[PDB]
Write a protein that binds this ligand. Structure first.
Ligand SMILES: Cc1cn([C@H]2C[C@H](O)[C@@H](COP(=O)(O)OP(=O)(O)O[C@H]3O[C@H](CO)[C@@H](O)[C@H](O)[C@H]3O)O2)c(=O)[nH]c1=O
Ligand SMILES: Cc1cn([C@H]2C[C@H](O)[C@@H](COP(=O)(O)OP(=O)(O)O[C@H]3O[C@H](CO)[C@@H](O)[C@H](O)[C@H]3O)O2)c(=O)[nH]c1=O
Ligand SMILES: Cc1cn([C@H]2C[C@H](O)[C@@H](COP(=O)(O)OP(=O)(O)O[C@H]3O[C@H](CO)[C@@H](O)[C@H](O)[C@H]3O)O2)c(=O)[nH]c1=O
Ligand SMILES: Cc1cn([C@H]2C[C@H](O)[C@@H](COP(=O)(O)OP(=O)(O)O[C@H]3O[C@H](CO)[C@@H](O)[C@H](O)[C@H]3O)O2)c(=O)[nH]c1=O
Ligand SMILES: Cc1cn([C@H]2C[C@H](O)[C@@H](COP(=O)(O)OP(=O)(O)O)O2)c(=O)[nH]c1=O
Ligand SMILES: Cc1cn([C@H]2C[C@H](O)[C@@H](COP(=O)(O)OP(=O)(O)O)O2)c(=O)[nH]c1=O
Ligand SMILES: Cc1cn([C@H]2C[C@H](O)[C@@H](COP(=O)(O)OP(=O)(O)O)O2)c(=O)[nH]c1=O
Ligand SMILES: Cc1cn([C@H]2C[C@H](O)[C@@H](COP(=O)(O)OP(=O)(O)O)O2)c(=O)[nH]c1=O
Lengths: 290, 290, 290, 290
């Protein structure tokens, strides 16, 4: 009944040491919220409310302390550990029992999107019956990502993970919608070129079958880079500038839950009261005025 | 009729002294281009090629040195002066002749909009045969702006200019679309207490007649503040973050002209060659290859 | 590791909620390292190698996992829990055994100091035989801090904690050096009207005995604000700007330990390798060559 | 009896196109003041009041319109055009008459310096009776600059302009103090490999004469980059961070003039008048009350 999604929020975070020896990348602040509120908000905006969060043995417990079972926000959250970061595709192997016979979305715990009409951008993917959908976004450094190449008619024709000679500048982002076939695909994958069970290898299987849709995410959207220390500071600054100008939050899960009807006002006021001593709780309380 | 454009780029710039003793506000850089490129970009995206720039007596020559007659970008730019900052609504008096019998789109020289489907956002406004269209955006400090009050059912019911007690948090942005009725409305206005001919008074008349459309600009759009030194730095950082991430420029008049067919590839390369030694020149040239 | 110092790294983290819901404020990044590296570097630059880290019941062990016993940096680190955030002066009661009969410096865990000749600005306070030294910095908002008032000759005459009517713009910063008498003073204190055991009350005692030295940190020093989410971004951007321009790190404990001779070249190399994927480890490795 | 200095503020500006198409680079804002205020403040801080500003044929008169003869600040400003940017040493040829038989300092118009005891560092160079003083600063990308090689005992042993294989990471900044011999040295210079009259060739002759002091500007100083659009934003954010924290301005000439006694209270209040309606004028006014 509730639609399903997985947030993959593990990984070593090597590239960010020594900051991530101290704290999981997906708990770092992006301005005024931990990084994982952002991909969580994306799933909620797609209308996905049953969500499995996968992290390392050390970090899962921290996420469980941050987010709980999710009922406070009208979600159902559950959790599993990935013993080692053996690839994004292991998400479906670990989450096979959670998924059952249902479709499932996957969002990476470091993926931040923002812009106008995000839900409508996702709508076709959410309602797809058969196949898979990913989103492409023009970047200046396609060699750091999965890269999708299109023909003159705009048909996707190839996908390559971190190519030395990228065939386009379109990166495949960290949000994926699959039908139920993904689970068996993942279970038959072999560790590839970089020694990982790769999501790109799943997507390539869908592409070879003619069932991968590639939704273009235009330049009016922001897909914020979380790859380096510098870009983490840029991401924060970006959110700060939007929020302080508007006096509205970006990816505040309480607010989304409220506006989408997952929780009612009585419940928003119950969340806000114990938090009214800080700016966040004051913002939540304001919601229930009008 | 056809729709002509006015960019109002006047004002003394006192809040920014001494920076604006040296350089007009609308020439200040927002990251990599002068501030006036951004509203000049909003007009082009709306399909407007015939544009009047109104500056102060002092600033006209520098805007002309920057933009010339516009022909390099398939535009036609003209210049008129505003002797003193007597109110936005003076633009229609100053431009009465350039406007003649046509519809008008006025944009303030310091207004910066960014977001997905911005041309669509303005589509209804451009295609409106009579009346006026304005844009409302939720801000944290509505007291600094024109403010539009809505009713329980979503209808604009009052407008107030920089009110001490705002009736809502929706500011009316500095982008306005009018039919041919406005020049006469402007000509019949009397100064407010503060001694300005107010654009808010014009909009109220249209509201009063049931002829004002108020299009909501969602939280997914960015409308960047340029009122303080601090917000300028934020505006620049915000644009930089986008452009460096995408490898694409925000509000590049040459690119928009080219993508909309105002100019052709042979004209783009002609523009690029003299500039080939700098980054801006190299971005132009590449756009002619792939 | 003869000389001693305490880093007070706990607190409720209320104002930063929800970022500090699952992470201590003092483990959050300031650009490319955890916040606590900064006050630790500060103590090291003063020549202090025996350091007690006090944090909350939940966070202390997290600091201990990250830093261990400090022998890898030539330091002696030990840890104590502060059961509740009942005031800075509690550091001396908690740290009573650690201190013993010795002088001791206290630095707050969220204090970031930068500027030419800081080690000299301090090295003196370290050499004072008796009494206490504090450092005063001109700020824009003195009401948020301990405030030191000076007479016409420049002699400190008054200290007040968070005064509604500040007598000066000089804030007393979170770096303090004390002789052995501070423990007894702290044991005799009673909470203030804020409900906290106040450092300002200890400083006032010394002031009245005529044994308080107030070092002025001029306008050439930076004492970075870490109060709000916004100020964390500001602090991170400031450090990033320095480091990226100079190709040198600010407050890197491995570098300071190597430069002051706490550890040797071999040791630095061994530390660098596990970090060598990014600039942080490469920077340490090259200090060994050049 | 006024000491003499030159601000070299010419050059193409091509790299910053289109931001420099209708605006001189050195009049662009660095946070709340035009760029040229910064080196101007630097010379003032050195106690130099008789200053020659050299720029392009197009920009020199813009500087003259902004600053006048400077006696409002207790300075004596004069102007000369550099027909083309044939090298920094040409400043001493164009400035020969202005120089006469006196010592002369040279600062680049886009260099920004900040740090504790900077005035003392410069007062030393100004106190020097014979020879020259330059300042060395560790940078990430030494190949862009004049580069100074040191002895194992840290004595400066060679200088190279933009070496392909830098011998150290110490760049020679754009602030130079010379005795009167510099004019004859410049006049004998021949164009370098870059076809320029190089300041590094002058410095090398003082160094080989044993008359060059190479003062180290340590890592607690900021020497800010102004060569890219991004470096401009970084320099603005760095200044805004210091100023907003301290409530004190960096390189405000009016403030410097007042504090060094070039002008008095009455004059300060006169300068405040045209600025009195924003924070900058208020800041000036308050210095004369507190
Ligand atoms: C390998 C691995 C990763 N992760 C987490 C860590 C990160 O927060 C997040 C992304 O992992 P990364 O190692 O950065 O993979 P990454 O280089 O970011 O690339 C992935 O993400 C990209 C989009 O960001 C795509 O363009 C690539 O095709 C996709 O492979 O997933 C796990 O939770 N488990 C893992 O085993
Ligand atoms: C009054 C005046 C302003 N300007 C320029 C200067 C600024 O770049 C910009 C706005 O200047 P302001 O001093 O805010 O103008 P002001 O009359 O007080 O306010 C207007 O500008 C605001 C912009 O959104 C609106 O929200 C208000 O509804 C509108 O009335 O337009 C002109 O070019 N000519 C002018 O006469
Ligand atoms: C009260 C308290 C504080 N702390 C830690 C948390 C932060 O690292 C640091 C600062 O805590 P604060 O609650 O910000 O105390 P604060 O309002 O900043 O004021 C203190 O620090 C200021 C300088 O930052 C001084 O000017 C004040 O005189 C001094 O009282 O101390 C603890 O670890 N335990 C505590 O009980
Ligand atoms: C050559 C030249 C430059 N300028 C202005 C343009 C720039 O704003 C500023 C510095 O110009 P650049 O062309 O970046 O400077 P460049 O000759 O490459 O390097 C100089 O400046 C560097 C410091 O920035 C030093 O490390 C070098 O040793 C010194 O030669 O001086 C002039 O006004 N006149 C000139 O002839
Ligand atoms: C096409 C184009 C858009 N824009 C800006 C205007 C809007 O803010 C935003 C619109 O992007 P978007 O609507 O997402 O792209 P698309 O129409 O290609 O699907 O980008 C430019 O700045 N330059 C351009 O060349
Ligand atoms: C509805 C909502 C959206 N968002 C974010 C998701 C998208 O990035 C963006 C959508 O804005 P937008 O589509 O422009 O809003 P609207 O429907 O009001 O016109 O805002 C939140 O952070 N919180 C919310 O409650
Ligand atoms: C020596 C050193 C100093 N610092 C900091 C302390 C001060 O805030 C700033 C300047 O210290 P400073 O001692 O004056 O400069 P220098 O070492 O070049 O002589 O640098 C570090 O962050 N790391 C270090 O390795
Ligand atoms: C006194 C003063 C200094 N400065 C700058 C020059 C140096 O970069 C920095 C520090 O100067 P410095 O004299 O060392 O600090 P202070 O007088 O407070 O001890 O401040 C100004 O910009 N304006 C001023 O009025």
């Amino acid at each position: 009944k509730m639609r399903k999604g997985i947030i993959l929020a593990g990984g070593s975070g090597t590239r960010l040491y020594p900051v991530t020896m101290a704290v999981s990348k997906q708990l770092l602040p992006i301005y005024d919220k931990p990084m994982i509120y952002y991909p969580l908000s994306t799933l909620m905006l797609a209308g996905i409310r049953d969500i499995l969060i996968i992290s390392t043995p050390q970090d899962t417990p921290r996420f469980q302390q941050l987010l709980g079972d999710g009922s406070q926000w009208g979600l159902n959250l559950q959790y599993k550990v990935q013993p080692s970061p053996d690839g994004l595709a292991q998400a479906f192997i670990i989450g096979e029992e959670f998924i059952g016979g249902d479709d499932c979305a996957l969002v990476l715990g470091d993926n931040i999107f923002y812009g106008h009409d995000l839900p409508k951008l996702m709508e076709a993917a959410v309602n797809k019956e058969s196949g898979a959908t990913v989103f492409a976004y023009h970047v200046n450094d396609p060699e750091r990502y999965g890269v999708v190449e299109f023909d003159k008619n705009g048909t996707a024709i190839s996908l390559e993970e971190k190519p030395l000679e990228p065939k386009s500048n379109y990166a495949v982002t960290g949000l994926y919608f699959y039908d139920n076939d993904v689970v068996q695909m993942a279970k038959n994958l072999k560790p590839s070129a970089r020694g990982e069970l790769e999501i790109t290898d799943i997507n390539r299987i869908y592409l070879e079958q003619g069932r991968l849709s590639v939704a273009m995410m235009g330049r009016g959207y922001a897909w914020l880079d979380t790859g380096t220390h510098q870009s983490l500071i840029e991401a924060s600054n970006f959110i700060a500038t939007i929020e302080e100008r508007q006096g509205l939050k970006v990816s505040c899960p309480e607010e989304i839950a409220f506006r989408k009807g997952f929780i009612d006002v009585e419940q928003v006021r119950k969340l806000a009261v114990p938090l009214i001593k800080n700016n966040y709780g004051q913002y939540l309380y304001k919601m229930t005025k009008d």
